[PDB]
Design a protein that fits this description.
The structure is cut from a larger assembly and holds chains A (about 120 residues) and B (about 100 residues). Chain A has about 120 residues and is mainly beta. Helices cover about 0% and strands about 50% of the residues of chain A. In chain A, strand 5 and strand 6 form a beta hairpin. Chain A is globular. The termini of chain A are far apart. Chain B is largely without helices or strands and about 100 residues long. Chain B has one helix and four strands; from the N terminus they run αββββ. Chain B has a two-stranded antiparallel ribbon with strand order 1-4. The longest helix of chain B has 6 residues. Classes of the chains: A mainly beta (about 120), B little secondary structure (about 100). The interface between A and B is medium-sized, with 11 and 13 residues. Chain B: This is Spike protein S1.
Chain lengths: ~120, ~100
Amino acid sequence: QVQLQESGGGLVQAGGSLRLSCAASGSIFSPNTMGWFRQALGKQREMVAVISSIASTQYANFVKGRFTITRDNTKNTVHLQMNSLIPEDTAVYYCYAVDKSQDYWGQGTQVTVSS
Amino acid sequence: QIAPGQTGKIADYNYKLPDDFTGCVIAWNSNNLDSKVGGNYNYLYRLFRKSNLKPFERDISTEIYQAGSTPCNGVEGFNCYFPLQSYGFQPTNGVGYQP
């Protein structure tokens, strides 16, 4: 049973910072790809960003130069540093492990930013 | 759309079945297994690809497709769309839209 633990969201005033975390357990074969997706109430899954085992990072234009992804090879975990927050980022986020086989999603992390 | 010689978004883009099958397609309806009240969007579906598959071909690429003339460079925008849209599996959906 592949499991992804996601944590680190909540309510933050405009301009604040957060650090989400997704830890992968189970099979997670070595050539994996971990990404983060956005969903606000009324819209679909918006791919926030993606990182592969190549260490390359791919980001969308919605949040240019603001959001960052960090890797931990020892525990094979990922941390999303969520900086320069804007009310347009008010959306629950999810984790996506491409891996090589069956894909697995997270349970959700509420991120709210307003004033 | 799961039978040989057929076309459609699934038959052309998802899982191509050669006209010369030997084997059986057996399906069920997971209305009380896979649907949730708030909608189960964990099942993803492409609508766009550059070309149709070959039989038993698998593409798990997430490259953004170029609907226009300008390149997308892995970023959505004008005439740039992600491959996968998710499904609104809900227990109140009609028989056609049920899982």
